[PDB]
Amino acid sequence: TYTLVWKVWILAVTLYYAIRIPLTLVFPSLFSPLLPLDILASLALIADIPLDLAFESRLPDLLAALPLDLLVFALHLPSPLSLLSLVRLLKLISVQRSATRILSYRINPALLRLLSLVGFILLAAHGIACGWMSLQPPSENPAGTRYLSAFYWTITTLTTIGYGDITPSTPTQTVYTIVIELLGAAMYGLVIGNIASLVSKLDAAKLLHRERVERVTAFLSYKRISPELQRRIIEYFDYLWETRRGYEEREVLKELPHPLRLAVAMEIHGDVIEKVPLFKGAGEEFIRDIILHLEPVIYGPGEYIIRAGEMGSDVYFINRGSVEVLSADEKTRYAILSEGQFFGEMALILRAPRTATVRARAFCDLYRLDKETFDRILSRYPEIAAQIQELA
Amino acid sequence: TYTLVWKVWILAVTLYYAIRIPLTLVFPSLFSPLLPLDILASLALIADIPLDLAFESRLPDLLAALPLDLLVFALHLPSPLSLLSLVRLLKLISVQRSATRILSYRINPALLRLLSLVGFILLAAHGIACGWMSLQPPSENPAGTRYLSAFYWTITTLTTIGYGDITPSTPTQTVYTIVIELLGAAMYGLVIGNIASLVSKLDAAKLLHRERVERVTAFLSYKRISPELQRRIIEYFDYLWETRRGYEEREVLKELPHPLRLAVAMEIHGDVIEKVPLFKGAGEEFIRDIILHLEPVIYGPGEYIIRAGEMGSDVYFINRGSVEVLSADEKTRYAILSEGQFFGEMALILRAPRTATVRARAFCDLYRLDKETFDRILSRYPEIAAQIQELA
Amino acid sequence: TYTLVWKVWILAVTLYYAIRIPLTLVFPSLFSPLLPLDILASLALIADIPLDLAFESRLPDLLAALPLDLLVFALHLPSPLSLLSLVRLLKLISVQRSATRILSYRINPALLRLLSLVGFILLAAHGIACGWMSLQPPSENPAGTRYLSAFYWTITTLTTIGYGDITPSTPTQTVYTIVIELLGAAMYGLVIGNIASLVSKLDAAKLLHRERVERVTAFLSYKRISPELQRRIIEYFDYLWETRRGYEEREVLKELPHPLRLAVAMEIHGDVIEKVPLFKGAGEEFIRDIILHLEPVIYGPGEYIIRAGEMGSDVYFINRGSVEVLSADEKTRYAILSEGQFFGEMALILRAPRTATVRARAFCDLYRLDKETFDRILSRYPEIAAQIQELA
Amino acid sequence: TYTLVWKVWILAVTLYYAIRIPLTLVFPSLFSPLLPLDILASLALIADIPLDLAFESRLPDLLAALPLDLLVFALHLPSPLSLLSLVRLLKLISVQRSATRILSYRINPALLRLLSLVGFILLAAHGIACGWMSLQPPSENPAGTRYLSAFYWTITTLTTIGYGDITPSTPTQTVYTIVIELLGAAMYGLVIGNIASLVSKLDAAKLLHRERVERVTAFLSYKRISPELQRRIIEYFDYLWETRRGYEEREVLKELPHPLRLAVAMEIHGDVIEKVPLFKGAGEEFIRDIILHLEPVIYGPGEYIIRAGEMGSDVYFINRGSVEVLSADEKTRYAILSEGQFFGEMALILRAPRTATVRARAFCDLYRLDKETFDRILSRYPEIAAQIQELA
């Protein structure tokens, strides 16, 4: 955090050179009551390269490092030889390459390139305006209203509006006008391309979800499906969008490695698995094996989770919704279960057919565990394998 | 549905302020025979925030809530201090954030952003035209033909045409012209970017299908394949496009959860599975286990589904097409089977070689069931396992 | 193929109306020595709707069907009431919706939308030029050089160049100029958006392949891999691009259904499997089971396919390359094998260690068969299971 | 490498014709003191087609091959018949189709199309400027300042700026101006479309990684997860970006074929597997079977790899990080292990519970081997199966 203020100082110094140098190439009456900031700023640029080595594709800084300027501005070099004082303007490559990585994950990398392009376009419109003001016929004109017309012209040309009120006169103006018309078309094409690349990927999570629903609907209309069930599928996708933004559960935490996925499943199913009267007193490495084999399912409002009279093979842990427990005639309510609790646990040890009917109330988000998977990962731990038989 | 008319009323009130405020900052002769709508509208804006709390990133509404206006327009505040009456124009952020979610799934979210941008561009071209008309040299000119020229100018500049018939004169006009040339280039770049993002994803289902066929064709031309079979593959992809829009069956209903996928398979194979003389009288939880293990295949016209003399291991249920049953010499037709019926059922219980040849007639869309899968999910139900032996 | 010429005739008739109607709304001296084509063309439009029903979102054709025109042009209706003769111009929606599906898979659907947009832009620039020529001050001017200036103006405005040599004069011209400046910006944004969507997906097969190689290279440089092997991987990807255009073998023919995939594998491995002295005389349903379980691998030039002294478990069928067979010291060449033949077959029946070393010569493209897969699908056919034991 | 200089010579000759031919169609005073390069260049073009056949969609070269020119320029053919000397300009299709494949994998194919388009736009702006200079009213004007104004005009029109200082006068100028306004809008739309397609796919690896992290974060905020673990996941994704650029290990080397994947795994795990005292003296075909079944996992700093007292089933090989070995109380350090070494090896032969606790120090990048996979691929090699029992 103490080199960040130095990078900001370097950015300020090179932004100062980018504003000052083409403005003083036109006006010789400057630079003399402003030389001390030249001294401070060239000392800053020559002192940057030891801090560019220590505590920190190298030749832009090396070419901006030397005082190639101050020699033109003292010895009063003529026009086609003065322009090498533009070599300091190569410093912006170094500042660009530093700022494109010191904050390359705070913000969107498309927005960063767009802001950098807008910065370079204004900072280069200043230089083009200074060049246009340079190759004018000299006359008595204050240095505000001869710069303001040149900046008006180089904005009218670069933004391709082209009013045409003030135009080239001489051939040496017309060649400069042709080459910056090419630069204006290039910069404005780059701006439109960056805005197009910025607003194309602007909504991807919300457009991929919209494409998937349109896919499922246009498939199920071919199978001549009922409209009630199709409305229920559409409201399922509305719930799954407005809670977890479209993403499926088991495809998200497949990209985590094993210790992080174990830790996430441990933070989720912590209070849920220290309630059952079968895993009580069991070891830690048994919990960490059953906790990685839970599978998420989502029941809509009014779905039958368990019908009484079915065989029944799985046990359900509730994470988010609520659920209700009914009798075999679906008339007399036994109780109501909410998040943090479980049901259907009397199937891991036993083959018996279900004894109650469990209907959902709202959207549930409940995890389940099979019996085949339970007995498969129960085999290699013989102590719980003998513990469950006395309850069996 | 009674807050929707209130949101429409709020949108109308803030659209009214956006049209009125810069038009009355230029003309002082207004606001006096039009004050009662100011009263009604500021009461609407100050009454919106209790309904913005109850029955409904907060400070735009809070800053648009206070009557910062009417004070400028009564006490006749001068020009650089009057412009704070623009604070009411911050209300459009609230209306934007409400309308971007109350109908965010009726229409395409790209079209919504494009329409919002066109609305803001016209509604801001009005304000820019009022500013241009404000900083004109005053003269005797009716208030229609001095607004019409200003709106003509601010459309010629923002749409980057730039005729150049009426241009800046003073420096204080030229600075305003430079800054709205930048705004015009920005808004027109945003329009081109949104149109490009709208017509890029406009045909995805029809372009992905076209890419897949071009992939398969360019691969099979490398293997030096026959042209007849390649024409048959291309007409298969034409059928699969013009019926179910390219999408494969088993990748679509893999994104549904278990109860919805069960219900869809139940609505499809309802009349198909209550016909066989083996599952008759069998339980409900056996149908719901064989109905999730059917696999779709599609035979073209003239394909051999079953050849007589083969071993034969699977049973086929017809969903959409038609099919014909032939003898072992493929000369004497036995019968014809259409949708809703089945064939090949004498292989689940028996090891016997096929006794007839079944050729397709048109494209079939028929589901099949294996014998290994049948015996695998038949093991855990012993009652049907003993029921099938007496037919075996 | 006899309704195609009728659709071309309908397209010609409505293109004729689109060119003629705004040109005769300006000039009253027309329509009288050109009425017989009006008769023929309105008869064509009113006769299209029975052929639009028989042998073939309906109301554009129904509104273009009636002779709402000829009444204006005979009874000489004035200007704000004549414009309903534009109702015939609604026919272009029907021709658009017909042509967007009768050839929707000959060409790229992006190119079709771009060509349709260019057609509508020229065909609407004609109408806008007729409107501009209509609201001019009348004077003595030939009907060529008053149309040519109007078409020059409506191309200078719509393509956003905007010279500004001929400009609006009256307010009723300026309103028309503002509204078609908006239309010009809209049409030119649509053109840039369609060109951008056309050249973005223009090279996808050649850019996805380039991304995959850059991915593999940037991963393997992290593992600090040798440069020789990395050059060999890059030349492997060059071979796989310049033969089958990047696509992997087993992901392409996974999108075909079972009968087409069976037929493709049958056309490939036809002459290859009627050579081995183990499958000779075996049934057809054994070939059709081993021919679906072959797996493609690709060896580079100089790779060791089989080393003599290894255990050896698989048999290799050559499809495209060539290969050479060497002794155990890799010094004395036995023979050379080319496409259509096989090697390594003495491992399906036997457990014996390999007896020769087989090096590749060029890139091979050879299919292999395992021994576990062979014995797994060999179990259910007992006759070949007893046939192979006497060779075992 | 000796046909590359010939392709460069052909490109130079046709670039010479593209610059010269429309410049000499305007000026008749040329071609006479410059005929020897016509002789050399037409001989080059007619000699290209035998080298286009030997050592190397054909008719552009065949139509550019004949000397259709020199006849116009000698016999002084008039204006509407001279223009067939433009047939030589069809050579650029051949040079385009050669250069689009001789370096089609050095650089990005989007940048190549953009550079080709800029080349054709300048090279066609020259021809359009020559045409504009051709249909001018003739007067006394030097051939520099009558070409410079025409090139200024055809750049002002094609880049859609449109100053409007010099405009059409005659109708035959205005038709030419309309048709090249259409060409200017087309070329500038193509430039904006190619820049948009170039900067849209410019950062894909860095944007896909950013989308995946935003996906995981927005999912885990729904599950109400702890902020400490969420910060640990975000720093895991920062490590995985700044080392191997986001790409997962086992999805990258799944696209290599079997011999290259074997060779890569051999170059990685070479010094790692010749250290264990169990595989010492074992055969080569056992190493090449255990080296393909290693699975990469990544532990963060401070994770528990092995807890002392657990059952323990796997052996870990370290590739990149460092790790520390602690006692059962996590207080007394035993030793420290770095890359190239391994731990946990006393579990392949034995069922015993772990005896030490191994915590990570930094990010590890370590490969592991299971015991089920080890015994599964250990079964088919009986010699090592009996070798491990005496250590068991």
Numbering used by the authors:
A (entry chain A), B (entry chain B), C (entry chain C), D (entry chain D): 10 to 65, 80 to 415
Would you copy out the relevant sentences from the publication that reported this structure?
The apo structure adopts an architecture different from any of the existing CNG/HCN structures, which is expected, as it is the first apo, resting state structure of a member of the CNG channel family. We present here the high-resolution cryo-EM structures of SthK in the apo, cAMP-bound, and cGMP-bound states in lipid nanodiscs. This is, to our knowledge, the first apo, resting structure of a member of the CNG channel family. We will call this the ‘activated’ CNBD conformation. In all our full-length SthK structures, whether apo, or ligand-bound, the C-helix is swung away from the binding pocket, most similar to the only reported apo CNBD conformation of HCN2. We will call this the ‘resting’ CNBD conformation. Roughly half way down the membrane, in the middle of this cavity, the side chains of I215 pointing radially towards the pore axis, constrict the pore to a diameter of the size of a dehydrated potassium ion similar to what is seen in the HCN1 and LliK channels pore. Thus, it is possible that the gate in SthK is located at a previously unreported location, in the middle of the cavity, which is the second narrowest point in the permeation pathway, after the selectivity filter. Since the channel experiences a membrane potential of 0 mV on the EM grid, and the median value for voltage activation is about 85 mV, the voltage sensor is likely in the down, resting conformation in the SthK structure. Since these channels are in lipid nanodiscs, and we see these densities in each of the three structures at the same positions, we assigned them to lipid molecules binding specifically to SthK (POPG, since the nanodiscs were assembled with this lipid only). Conversely, the conformational change is less favored when less efficacious agonists are bound, so that most bound channels are closed. Our data shows identical, closed structures for the apo and inefficacious, partial agonist-bound SthK channels, which is consistent with the concerted gating model (the functional states - closed - that we solved with cryo-EM are indicated by dashed green circles in Figure 8E, top).
